[PDB]
Amino acid sequence: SKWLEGIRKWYYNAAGFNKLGLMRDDTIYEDDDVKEAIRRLPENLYNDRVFRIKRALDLTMRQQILPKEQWTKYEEDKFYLEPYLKEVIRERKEREEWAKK
Amino acid sequence: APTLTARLYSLLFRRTSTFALTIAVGALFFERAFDQGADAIYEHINQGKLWKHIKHKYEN
Amino acid sequence: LSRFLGPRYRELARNWIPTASMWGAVGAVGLVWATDWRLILDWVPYINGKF
Amino acid sequence: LSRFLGPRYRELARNWIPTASMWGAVGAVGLVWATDWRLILDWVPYINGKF
Amino acid sequence: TFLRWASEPEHDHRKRMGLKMLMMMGLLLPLVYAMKRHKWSVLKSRKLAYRPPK
Amino acid sequence: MTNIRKSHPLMKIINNAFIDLPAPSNISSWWNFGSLLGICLILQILTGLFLAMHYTSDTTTAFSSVTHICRDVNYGWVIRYLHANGASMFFICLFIHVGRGLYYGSYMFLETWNIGVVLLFTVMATAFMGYVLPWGQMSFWGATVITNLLSAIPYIGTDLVEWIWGGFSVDKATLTRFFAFHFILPFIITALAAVHLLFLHETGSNNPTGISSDMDKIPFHPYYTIKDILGALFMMLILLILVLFSPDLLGDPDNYTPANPLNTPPHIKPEWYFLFAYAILRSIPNKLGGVLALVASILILILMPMLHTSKQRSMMFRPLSQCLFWMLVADLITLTWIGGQPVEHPFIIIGQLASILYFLIILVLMPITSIIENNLLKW
Amino acid sequence: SHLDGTTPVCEDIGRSLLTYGRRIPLAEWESRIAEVDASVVREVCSKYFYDQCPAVAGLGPIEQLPDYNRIRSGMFWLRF
Numbered sequence: 130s131k132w133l134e135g136i137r138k139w140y141y142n143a144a145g146f147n148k149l150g151l152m153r154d155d156t157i158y159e160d161d162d163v164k165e166a167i168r169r170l171p172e173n174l175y176n177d178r179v180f181r182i183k184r185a186l187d188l189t190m191r192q193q194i195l196p197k198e199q200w201t202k203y204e205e206d207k208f209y210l211e212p213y214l215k216e217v218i219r220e221r222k223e224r225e226e227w228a229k230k
Numbered sequence: 231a232p233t234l235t236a237r238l239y240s241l242l243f244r245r246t247s248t249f250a251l252t253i254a255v256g257a258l259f260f261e262r263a264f265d266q267g268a269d270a271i272y273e274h275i276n277q278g279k280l281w282k283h284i285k286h287k288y289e290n
Numbered sequence: 291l292s293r294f295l296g297p298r299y300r301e302l303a304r305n306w307i308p309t310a311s312m313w314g315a316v317g318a319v320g321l322v323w324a325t326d327w328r329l330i331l332d333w334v335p336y337i338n339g340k341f
Numbered sequence: 342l343s344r345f346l347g348p349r350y351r352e353l354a355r356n357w358i359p360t361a362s363m364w365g366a367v368g369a370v371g372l373v374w375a376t377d378w379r380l381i382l383d384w385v386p387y388i389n390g391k392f
Numbered sequence: 393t394f395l396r397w398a399s400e401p402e403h404d405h406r407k408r409m410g411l412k413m414l415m416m417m418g419l420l421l422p423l424v425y426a427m428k429r430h431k432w433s434v435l436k437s438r439k440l441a442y443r444p445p446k
Numbered sequence: 447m448t449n450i451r452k453s454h455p456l457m458k459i460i461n462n463a464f465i466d467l468p469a470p471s472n473i474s475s476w477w478n479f480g481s482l483l484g485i486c487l488i489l490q491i492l493t494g495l496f497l498a499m500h501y502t503s504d505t506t507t508a509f510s511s512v513t514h515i516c517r518d519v520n521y522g523w524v525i526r527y528l529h530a531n532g533a534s535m536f537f538i539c540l541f542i543h544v545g546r547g548l549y550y551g552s553y554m555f556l557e558t559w560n561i562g563v564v565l566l567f568t569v570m571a572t573a574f575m576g577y578v579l580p581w582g583q584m585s586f587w588g589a590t591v592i593t594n595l596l597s598a599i600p601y602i603g604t605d606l607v608e609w610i611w612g613g614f615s616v617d618k619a620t621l622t623r624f625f626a627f628h629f630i631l632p633f634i635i636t637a638l639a640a641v642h643l644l645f646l647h648e649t650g651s652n653n654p655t656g657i658s659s660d661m662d663k664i665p666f667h668p669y670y671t672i673k674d675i676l677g678a679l680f681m682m683l684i685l686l687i688l689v690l691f692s693p694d695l696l697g698d699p700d701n702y703t704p705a706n707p708l709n710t711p712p713h714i715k716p717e718w719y720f721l722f723a724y725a726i727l728r729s730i731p732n733k734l735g736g737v738l739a740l741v742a743s744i745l746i747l748i749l750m751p752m753l754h755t756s757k758q759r760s761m762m763f764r765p766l767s768q769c770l771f772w773m774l775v776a777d778l779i780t781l782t783w784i785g786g787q788p789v790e791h792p793f794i795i796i797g798q799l800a801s802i803l804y805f806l807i808i809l810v811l812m813p814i815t816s817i818i819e820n821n822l823l824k825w
Numbered sequence: 826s827h828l829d830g831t832t833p834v835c836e837d838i839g840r841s842l843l844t845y846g847r848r849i850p851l852a853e854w855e856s857r858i859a860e861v862d863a864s865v866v867r868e869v870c871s872k873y874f875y876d877q878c879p880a881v882a883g884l885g886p887i888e889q890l891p892d893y894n895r896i897r898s899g900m901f902w903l904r905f
């Protein structure tokens with residue numbers, strides 16, 4: 130319940146990708162399914178993701194962190210990529226299930 | 231009035247060929263000066279503990 | 291090589307002769323410095339202190 | 342590797358088991374011949390005449 | 393001391409070369425570091441912006 | 447017209463490898479060590495070659511030739527200690543490189559990672575055979591123990607170890623074989639490193655964030671050539687400190703006595719960069735089990751990519767995984783220390799616990815922790 | 826050629842008076858041009874181009890546009 134929410138928020142703060150302005154779905158490993166999901170993103174979301182990732186890379190190059198008020202809040206972190214990734218994974222699972230028989 | 235660094239660039243660093251010659255001539259003088267200084271430091275630290283400092287007693 | 295026997299190449303040479311001469315001096319100074327020729331380094335005022 | 346757990350894959354294994362067994366026999370015979378194992382070659386009629 | 397010399401006949405020369413290399417490295421590391429900073433200032437000072445026409 | 451750099455075949459290769467290679471803009475100093483490794487390799491090839499101009503691989507003239515290099519050859523001691531401490535620097539850089547690969551999820555490059563594992567095996571074999579060349583007490587007896595390990599292989603162990611020995615034990619045949627293999631192997635290492643770079647450049651390089659950096663790629667030359675030059679300068683500073691102030695810091699003194707097959711030295715241990723493996727080797731009382739554990743302790747890098755259960759590639763945003771990684775590093779340090787120490791009451795149990803912890807962390811704790819982290823992020 | 830037409834001549838007159846403070850006759854322009862030779866061109870280009878920091882503006886698919894360090898390095902010759 131609220132205990133799980135508290136530990137999840139603590140972990141989100143500890144995993145400092147919000148300190149770089151990134152969102153959770155910007156840090157996922159770009160395997161084949163994630164690449165296909167990115168390919169299906171609408172143009173605005175793709176551009177926003179590209180800029181956020183580039184800014185994070187610049188910050189890590191300078192070994193610096195975004196101002197405290199610019200960190201991505203846990204409650205306002207939107208999982209934009211999750212639906213597309215889920216759809217791609219379902220399609221892959223369907224293809225594999227067909228291949229089994 | 232141009233600064234010393236401005237003079238250096240205009241006369242020596244502007245053209246790479248002159249830039250190379252400055253380095254080559256500089257390396258010649260630097261090696262002699264640096265070795266002479268470094269040897270002096272080492273010999274001063276170890277004064278009286280080297281053969282060159284005690285040979286006179288046994289030489290000749 | 292008559293292709294290069296023209297007035298422009300004569301002008302081209304004169305433009306690059308000072309540069310080539312400068313690089314030659316770098317090679318000459320470098321060779322003397324690297325090998326410690328001492329046929330030439332004896333003349334050099336401060337370097338001749340060594341040997 | 343649950344992707345490879347299905348009737349079609351079992352059919353594939355059935356199809357390729359004879360070939361895999363033949364290749365394993367090839368490998369075993371090649372190893373015995375190359376090493377001159379003599380633990381197995383003693384049983385072979387004409388070959389065991391050697392040594 | 394004699395046995396120390398016997399085991400390490402290059403002791404003194406080794407120390408001398410170490411002093412020279414220490415001086416040269418203390419001279420060079422800041423210089424090459426400054427050259428790296430000079431090359432990398434273009435990226436370190438760069439300022440990115442995002443201007444979607446929307 | 448064209449550009450010679452981008453047109454000429456050799457120039458094309460060089461330009462696409464080290465001049466116009468798109469490189470991530472945020473790779474930290476941990477990405478220097480790769481180039482450092484190459485530097486080290488080249489050094490070991492050069493320095494070692496100049497040691498081969500005076501070293502003879504006969505048991506009657508091996509130790510004497512090494513002393514001739516150290517006493518009579520002009521600057522021979524410089525070259526000898528450059529080689530000896532450059533092997534140690536090579537292994538420091540190798541361990542840091544493998545740690546960087548583990549931490550930042552660089553093992554997802556399967557081909558590059560596997561070629562790296564092969565390189566690690568080859569470099570370890572090269573160093574082991576090279577340490578025998580001085581033919582001191584430590585060289586002879588460490589060679590004896592490590593080769594005798596092979597006798598634990600069932601059935602063919604004795605024949606294999608005797609074939610490698612060239613006789614019934616470590617002797618002149620073994621010394622000459624090791625000299626030849628030690629000479630030849632680094633060139634195979636260079637070929638494997640070229641193949642390694644070939645595989646790496648197929649997908650570019652990873653970055654500390656673990657996120658694809660195609661949006662923020664920079665030319666390799668003006669930035670990372672000077673950065674790698676600075677890293678090589680710092681590495682050369684450390685190496686020259688070792689060579690000129692503590693040349694014998696990383697070498698056991700007992701290797702300065704000529705090999706005595708009839709008398710063991712007070713303590714027998716390999717060079718430090720093997721001690722950790724040695725520790726694991728001694729954790730298992732069984733000989734064959736010990737050898738298998740030793741082999742697995744390095745083959746586990748092959749399994750590493752298949753154990754990655756995290757949705758994120760780099761441990762940068764995985765604090766629990768960071769804790770596990772640093773536990774692994776401390777465990778490896780503990781294994782090195784125990785391998786240095788003798789086999790007595792506390793050291794046996796601490797080494798066994800350390801080996802169990804190493805395998806548990808790599809095989810069990812890390813994937814479970816990654817799954818827990820995935821749950822905490824609601825992946 | 827640029828001074829063919831009443832409008833170009835008026836534009837030239839106005840711009841010259843604003844900038845130069847005077848109308849430069851074509852004879853003076855021709856004299857200044859005739860003063861130019863290869864040595865003058867080399868000297869002036871070296872003054873304004875050789876080993877100078879440029880200002881660059883890119884727009885569009887400019888991913889291949891060389892990095893500013895590379896362009897600056899291109900603004901001088903190692904052979905020279």
Ligand code: HEM
Pocket residue numbers: 487490491492493494495496497498501512515526529530533536569572573576577578579580628629632633635
């Ligand atoms: C990755 C490459 C190499 C590594 C890691 C390596 C490592 C070593 C090590 C640890 C030693 C023991 C030195 C001592 O105990 O004093 C050694 C000795 C030696 N190595 Fe290398 N080596 C490499 C490449 C080479 C190459 C390419 C050559 C020849 C072309 C070479 C020739 C020698 C010789 C002749 C010795 C014996 C001389 C001596 O012990 O002082 N090595 N090597």
Ligand code: HEM
Pocket residue numbers: 476477478479480481483484487540543544547550552553555558559561562563565566569635639642643646650651652653747
């Ligand atoms: C003689 C041995 C080796 C040499 C000469 C060598 C050389 C290099 C070089 C030059 C790079 C590119 C620079 C860099 O990424 O830092 C690199 C990257 C890499 N190496 Fe090696 N390496 C060696 C051993 C290894 C080992 C032992 C491993 C793993 C067990 C390994 C795995 C990798 C990986 C995964 C990368 C890519 C990392 C990334 O791009 O983020 N290599 N190596």
